[PDB]
Design a protein around this ligand. Structure first.
Ligand code: MML
Ligand code: MML
Ligand code: MML
Ligand code: MML
Ligand code: RU
Ligand code: RU
Ligand code: RU
Ligand code: RU
Ligand code: RU
Ligand code: RU
Ligand code: RU
Ligand code: RU
Ligand code: RU
Ligand code: RU
Ligand code: RU
Ligand code: RU
Lengths: 173, 173, 173, 173
């Protein structure tokens, strides 16, 4: 059973399992994005790398949530990971827009869980998401917004040229 | 416009701009305090340094707030910085009392903003001020209270002697 | 009072206090410029950094002037810092033009003070501004003129592309 | 004779020789001050050291002036060094007041020489005193003013105690 569970509602436990699924789905979406930019007919290494980095970050988030679930005496329950929404992701601009939409959705889910935990009187969950999730999301979304603005400025006139330059001069390590 | 703003009210955005102005005004007040203690007819180096340190700390606080404003998709709006309340600051005791009053006012403004963000359901702002502002203020106010007590104990009898000794033995690096 | 003041007119003392206010206002303007280029819908890091660097340089200038004021036995008097002339600063070209106008105004104020000190027979002030101010201004204005020329050359045709390239290849550290 | 003299008036040459004599006399005064504070019935090591430091600084100033005299093709002419104005120098307060009076007199002599060189159209002399003399004097006079203020604050009530504390906590290395 559990010998440790204290002040941890079934509602929060369920919400945490949903958040795990959302973070893993986000990770899977970023894996698809990464390999799309690795196609020989796409071939934007900086972009591929940006998304592969995010795949790992999202997986790490899911893992931290699962660790927290066990620390509180809750029980992890996994669901299917739905395949990403697209098989082909278009331009770097299209991809960055999809990424922002995805991150905003995770952020909203975190805000929904915080509003649950506060309604459940759960201070620990509240300082857990605080912390390794809400702040990280804000910073990442700002970075993505900065990127979108730069990508948009570079769309001429000459979209191909701009796409190459962004990958070379902003993204590539 | 902004492509990133999420769960960030116009009320909080305005409050953050006000807090920026308050921190910069505090920085300006500490600049005035610092140079006052640098006067040849005042000449208390430890005291000058204590206040110049605080001028930089307050400026840094304003800058962190401005960074947060942009991270959330809010827009910085600057107002005039009102000149400090005094041109001459009296004794080290007078100056330390004015500093405590000033810090208490910043702290109260932070508490007012936290009470706004909670009423706005904004967990990120709440863990932003938590964090790099509320705890810092508490520690600084305690230090100032400790200093005031020591300064007061040293006021004889022989105020000049006590003022010199505090600067030499507590404040001076 | 002062026990040290020698060959230091009330007119020069007042002029120095005005110059302090001008340098601090310039610092505040550069702070506004810096955070504008940090907006998610502007997002030009090299430009943000260029202006934040200048904010610190101008503050440092004000501080050197205040130190000199006390060394001569004059008394610092602070005035309000007027908010910057704009809330939004347009393009990198607009911003660099505003910066040049601002620096030229500081330079003119330094030239006005030198012409005062010479009319006051004050050699020390004359070799103080010589020195840490006039030469610095000339070098900075030349750098800004160089930047403006490069920015202008890059305005096509394709203004977005040129703005990105200047930030990436000239400004960004 | 000289094969190098250019734009160097007999009036400036004479003024430089007078300044040499003034700096050497100041050095001699500081030597007397230093050894007075070394008396077994005075015994203030920090004070003795402060003045012995100044004796060396003033001698170094005289030497720089003599070097400049030869660089310009002028001819050094030495006069008697008048013995210092006092044989006993009283308290640290009395001594610091005498030192400030002495430095102000050197500064005034430098200002008189600058006003000569400008009336002689001598830019080199003007940037020579600028430079290794006028700025040094301003800084030293400020330091002395700071010291006087601290000494005065310490005169109770209990003059002996204050004199000891200043020597221990401000002056002594
Ligand atoms: C942040 C980060 C992640 C992965 C790498 C690889 C390319 C070594 C570099 C930086
Ligand atoms: C905390 C602090 C800040 C500034 C200094 C300067 C004097 C080096 C030292 C310590
Ligand atoms: C000149 C200068 C000023 C600041 C920095 C930061 C980015 C380290 C670098 C260079
Ligand atoms: C500035 C100075 C001059 C002399 C000494 C001696 C005591 C070593 C130390 C410092
Ligand atoms: Ru790859
Ligand atoms: Ru990487
Ligand atoms: Ru919370
Ligand atoms: Ru100081
Ligand atoms: Ru310090
Ligand atoms: Ru809170
Ligand atoms: Ru930045
Ligand atoms: Ru830099
Ligand atoms: Ru000049
Ligand atoms: Ru000795
Ligand atoms: Ru020494
Ligand atoms: Ru001159």
């Amino acid at each position: 059973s559990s010998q440790i569970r204290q002040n941890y509602s079934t509602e929060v436990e369920a919400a945490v399992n949903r958040l795990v699924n959302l973070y893993l789905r986000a990770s899977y979406t970023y894996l698809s994005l990464g390999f799309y930019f690795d196609r020989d007919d796409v071939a934007l290494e900086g972009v591929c790398h940006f998304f592969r980095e995010l795949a790992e970050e999202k997986r790490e988030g899911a893992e931290r949530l699962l660790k927290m679930q066990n620390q509180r005496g809750g029980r992890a329950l996994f669901q299917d990971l739905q395949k990403p929404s697209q098989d082909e992701w278009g331009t770097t601009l299209d991809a960055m827009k999809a990424a922002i939409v995805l991150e905003k959705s995770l952020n909203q889910a975190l805000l929904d869980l915080h509003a649950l935990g506060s309604a459940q009187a759960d201070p620990h969950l509240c300082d857990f998401l605080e912390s390794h999730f809400l702040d990280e999301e804000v910073k990442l979304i700002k970075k993505m917004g900065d990127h979108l603005t730069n990508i948009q400025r570079l769309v001429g006139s000459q979209a191909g040229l701009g796409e190459y330059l962004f990958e070379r001069l902003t993204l590539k390590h």
